[PDB]
RNA sequence: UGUGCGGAUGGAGGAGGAUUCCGACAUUUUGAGGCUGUGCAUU
RNA sequence: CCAACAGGGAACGUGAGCUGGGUUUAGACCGUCGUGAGACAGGUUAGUUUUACCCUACUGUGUGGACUGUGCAGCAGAUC
RNA sequence: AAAUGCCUCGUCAUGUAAUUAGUGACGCGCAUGAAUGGAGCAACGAGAUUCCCACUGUCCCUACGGCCUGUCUUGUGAACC
RNA sequence: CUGCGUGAGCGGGGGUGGAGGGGCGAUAUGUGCAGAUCUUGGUAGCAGUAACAAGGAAAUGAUUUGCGCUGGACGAGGGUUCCCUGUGGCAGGGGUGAAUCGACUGUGGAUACGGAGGUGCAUUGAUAGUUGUGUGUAUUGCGGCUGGGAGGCGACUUGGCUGUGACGGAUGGGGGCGGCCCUGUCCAGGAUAGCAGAACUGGAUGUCUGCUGCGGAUUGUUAUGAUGCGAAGCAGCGAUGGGCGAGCCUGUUCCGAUGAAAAAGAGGCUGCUUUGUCGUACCUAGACCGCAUCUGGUGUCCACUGUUUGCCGCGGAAGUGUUUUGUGCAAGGGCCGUAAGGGAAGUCGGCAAGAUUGAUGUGUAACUUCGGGAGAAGGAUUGGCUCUAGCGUGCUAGAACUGUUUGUUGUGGGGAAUCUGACUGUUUACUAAAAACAUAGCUUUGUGUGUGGACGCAAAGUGAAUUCUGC
RNA sequence: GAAGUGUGAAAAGGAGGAUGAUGAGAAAUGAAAGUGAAUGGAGUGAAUGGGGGAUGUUCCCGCCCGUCUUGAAACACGGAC
RNA sequence: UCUCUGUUCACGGGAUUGAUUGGCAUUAGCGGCGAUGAAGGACGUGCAGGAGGACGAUAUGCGUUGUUGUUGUGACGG
């Protein structure tokens, strides 16, 4: 059989895994006799060799759970496992509050108030 | 490994072209029948020591 | 774990091939051959009674000393051309 | 054989082996070599910055024109403009106390 | 074991011109659906 | 509590049945003794439990109908 | 009567239905005792001990169920004695 | 097979075998075996037994479907195991290309420290920062032409020299290579009984650390601050779609510890010419070491996603590995699950198992070196859905409704006493982890000089503090 | 720091089997331990031995050798062939 | 059939008998290496070649001289 030489050359040309390749079962005499990289590229244009598709996991039921808790849906006392500081650090709420009220004072002074 | 000294490389080459059986035209002679080289080495069993 | 498990750590090599005698016994950190004693000008005293008969006069080729012995049976006549000068 | 990083040479993370990641125009991901980091020039007296001299390693530095390697005034390669004024005033005022 | 799918009538409230859309769950059709190695009959 | 809570033997029955608390080499503490290395049937604490697939014994099982007789072997109820 | 007390399961009190265990007190102490260190426990300990709550197949007294072995087949095929 | 001899032994007959073999006297001896846990070689019983293997399938198997989790690169070690052809594992013939990869050069040392020089795209059966090609950088030698000054109050601009190499730990703020997520638009892909405001997947597009002049008293940080030794401000110089951070920029802090050395400086615009030697195939564990296709050991780098404080656990991708005619389950084992009523009666001994467990309000004693003890102990709440409030827009607080009562589908058992060691640490590689050893503190002794000069250097004992240390 | 010498006078020839050829001869000789096939006899008693008789047995006698020891069949040691 | 024991043929193993270009001893002579680069080591050399032996880029051997017609060989020199 020539199966082992065709999956090693075709997997390098197409840059995929050896199991994602489909070899036409009804053209065993074209598949037996390739032997070069230039002949493997002709069978890829003639659809004697085809590349399967990957699984990409869907995010549809993960996007529904993210817009539900933007309304506050899965955040009660039974759903928290880190501490209050781990999931919203207190030093970073302090920085955000005094940079905003140091900015008002700078423009209340520039307007004469 | 890929890295090796020049003296290590030329002794590995000599050891390589030694590991060979008696040629066929010599075994076919009348007075050399039933002779095999018998000084053969296989890389898993016996080690060369550099 | 001083048995089987300690053997998996032994991948450093201390020696190399000696340029005087050809054994794997030239210690690189010591700068010294443990077989022949290189780089001392004299060769090392052998370590056993059998060691004396593994490397001596006659265990190699004797490329020059054989020739000289054939010349001393005939009185050391040399090349017939140069014999006029002598 | 999807999704690999291409890396050439040794892998130890020293000062002289820093790498970035880049996507090449054919879709590959490569761990590429970055020049060795060179520091800013300072004054040798007050430790202020001399922001105009180039930041290069010593061999590439020496291949530049003199306008890249110094400032145009005395001590221009090592000293600050503020420390040179005081050094001139101090030299002149000293000679006036010795001719008196 | 415990009242099936689908439909119909409701639902704390919210959204906004259509008298529309979103909504856990409720009542009804319905001791209802699913399952069985035991017994009887038949093919 | 009970009718009553007798005494003994079987390689001081029974570790290829178990367990390892006593005893228990190599670590350590205290008291007394010794110039010392060390000692004590004086006290204290920490300290590997190997192998049956052979012969015999014993338990079943196999060693070619149906209905029965009669020899041998086993043997059960006890107490309030 | 302590990791140091022979006599010794010392004597009295306390915890139990019942205490050669534990803790408190006593002291002519075979043979306690002051850098051979004495007295002393805040904090720390996979160190040694005794008791309480909680909890349970540890036990009264065992039952039923799962997977891999064993039981049965083919191949490869040792050892102790 | 047969005769003779008390015996040690000696004769004859028939097959086999295919070249030598004896009697008698004296003489020379490495001169006679059942044993020595005798030496070397061969062979039985045990026994077709113990042990190991039989991996999910589909008459076919380049096609369809089911399961497992290491996957990809550099060094040490190995050395042709790499590719093609023929053949039942061998046999025959091929394959490793360098100014810009490493070393041959520095330092009393080096394939990780110092150091003249690059990035894309394509290409073989097997090599590629090495072959080919688009563009760049350095270098060997040989030429041609050309300048020693102009500017700016200043910071500085220019063919216009004497600079660098060259240096520790912890931690905050700013800003981000690549990857991943949310979002507008445009072009495509795969599955579908029925329904779905029109889902799911891929690709393409969508400024100030500093310095100078004027000025002449205020000004700023997450934090410590800055300023008549010249603040702010104005004008310059120089430097450089939204959100989750690596190198980078800028601070603070810690030490009886303060964080190597040497090689390697010159430079304008142009034309020709040069670039030595050795390594380069293949394998992270069935290509290494452990006698082996051995559940052990072996330096460095990169690696997606749901849930979550968590790169853990509990589940998924990518890449990679894998078979297709043994049985169906006695007793007894190894690893586990559930149990009426009782609740340590078991046992040397609660050994083993069970039990507590995340987060947020509440409530916390004796003692104490005032720091601790402390998450002491003890009690309560927790899902889904639909809304309200705050500002910093993802977290925090509040309310109604709802179910076969129930929500952490993970994460400490606690308390009262005695003995002992102060504490974090260290130990009998392969039966002892400790009360042993170390330790700070405390005390004693010697010594006027070693490169070292008494707050030094060396030798002993005791073992934190507190209170003491008698004759 | 080992273990391993032999077809024949002549290659006149073989090397899965069978049928054959060459040669004086299928080819150095080929013991014991142990095994397979056929065929005769015996057995359900550990076996084996001596006397006396007989084509197996029937009566009598008979514990396993070597060694050290006052003393061995020894629950004394060495000994599968 | 199985266990023990006669007989005949076939296995298994390598003792025995007979050989031997090897070993061991005594005796007579000799005791002949190197800066004019030794002994020893590494790597190479055949049209078709691995081990051993032989040989050194004049490499599976060259020149002179003797004996040969041969797979040729002896003695000496390079
Ligand atoms: Zn040597």
TrEMBL record, chain A:
One GO CC annotation: cytosolic large ribosomal subunit
Domain Large ribosomal subunit protein eL19: start-end pairs: 2-113
Keywords annotated in UniProt: Ribonucleoprotein, Ribosomal protein
GO biological process: translation
GO molecular function list: RNA binding; structural constituent of ribosome
Family statement drawn from the similarity comment of this UniProt entry: Belongs to the eukaryotic ribosomal protein eL19 family.
Official protein name in the record: 60S RIBOSOMAL PROTEIN L19
From-to range in the entire protein, with total length: 2 to 114 of 171
């Amino acid at each position: 059989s020539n199966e082992e030489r065709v999956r090693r050359l075709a997997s390098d040309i197409l840059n995929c895994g050896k199991k994602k390749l489909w070899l036409d079962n009804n053209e065993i005499e074209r598949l037996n006799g390739a032997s070069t990289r230039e002949q493997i590229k002709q069978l890829i244009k003639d659809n004697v060799i085809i590349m399967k598709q990957d699984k990409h996991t869907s995010r549809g039921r993960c996007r529904k759970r993210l817009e539900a808790k933007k309304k506050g849906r899965h955040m009660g006392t039974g759903k928290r496992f880190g501490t209050a500081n781990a999931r919203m650090p207190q030093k970073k709420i302090w920085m955000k509050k005094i940079r905003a009220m140091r900015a008002m004072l700078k423009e209340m002074r520039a307007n004469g108030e | 490994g890929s890295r090796k000294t020049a003296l290590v490389k030329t002794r590995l080459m000599r050891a390589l072209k030694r590991n060979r059986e008696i040629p066929a035209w010599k075994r076919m002679m009348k007075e050399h029948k039933g002779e095999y080289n018998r000084a053969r080495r296989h890389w898993r069993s016996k080690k060369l020591k550099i | 774990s001083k048995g089987t498990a300690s053997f998996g750590k032994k991948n450093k090599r201390n020696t190399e091939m000696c340029r005087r005698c050809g054994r794997q016994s030239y210690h690189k950190q010591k700068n010294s051959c443990s077989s022949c004693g290189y780089p001392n000008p004299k060769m090392r005293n052998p370590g056993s009674i059998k060691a004396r008969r593994r490397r001596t006069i006659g265990t190699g080729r004797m490329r020059y000393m054989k020739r000289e012995l054939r010349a001393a049976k005939n009185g050391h006549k040399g090349d017939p051309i140069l014999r006029t000068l002598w | 054989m999807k999704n690999v990083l291409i890396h050439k040479g040794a892998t130890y993370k020293t000062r002289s082996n820093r790498r970035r990641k880049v996507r090449t125009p054919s879709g590959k991901l490569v761990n590429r070599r970055v020049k060795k980091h060179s520091k800013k020039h300072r004054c040798h007296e007050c430790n202020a910055i001399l922001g105009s001299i180039a930041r290069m390693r010593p061999a590439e530095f020496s291949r530049q024109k003199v306008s890249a390697r110094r400032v145009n005034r005395p001590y221009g390669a090592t000293t600050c403009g503020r420390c040179v004024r005081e050094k001139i005033i101090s030299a002149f005022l000293g000679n006036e106390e010795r001719i008196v």
